[PDB]
Symmetry: C3
Subunit: 40 residues, 3 copies
């Protein structure tokens, strides 16, 4: 079931974003690959 | 063009995150595959 | 290392979401491909 994201972070060493989820004991995350770059 | 996200959810059954968008009739979403897992 | 997201936007022309990061000079983003579609 869809559950809300309580905090979103991203990481330019791992090239992943991690979404902390509201569910159960509070220790579930969603995580996906991303590009990370400097604008301008 | 980039539009704001009003709410972000993720789902450990479908392995998707869904971003509700502020645009048009209010019923547009962005969605992507994700990993979902327990930590700790 | 993980850094906070300050703003999340998504774009139905590019089919990407972009996360502005709290890091460094403030001009780093994470960006990933997404589906974008109308619901209901
Ligand atoms: C002089 C200095 O410290 N420059 C920093 C860059 O080194 C750093 O870019 C990463 O550098 C490592 C090598 O140390 C590479 O393996 C990565 O591929 C580089 N990442 C990117 C996206 O270019 C940048 C960026 O820092 C990274 O991304 C941030 C958003 C954050 O997650 C940091 O923790 C992460 O290291 O920062 C310069 O200051
Ligand atoms: C006893 C009990 O209820 N255990 C729950 C797990 O079943 C559940 O893990 C999912 O289980 C289904 C089969 O029922 C699998 O098809 C999924 O692959 C499992 N998902 C994961 C990520 O392991 C877990 C996790 O719940 C899921 O993810 C949450 C973040 C949330 O989105 C839930 O709605 C979703 O079902 O929870 C245990 O309690
Ligand atoms: C009459 C009108 O303006 N209709 C709009 C649609 O054209 C638009 O759908 C995009 O249309 C372009 C060509 O104009 C296509 O290349 C895209 O593939 C279409 N995208 C999608 C997702 O269908 C829709 C949706 O607008 C897009 O997505 C929004 C979330 C936002 O990012 C917009 O800036 C973006 O154009 O909107 C209709 O109103």
């Amino acid at each position: 079931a869809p559950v809300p994201v309580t905090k979103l972070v991203c990481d330019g060493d791992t090239y992943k974003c991690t979404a902390y989820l509201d569910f159960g004991d509070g220790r579930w995350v969603a995580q996906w690959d991303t590009n990370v770059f400097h604008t301008g």
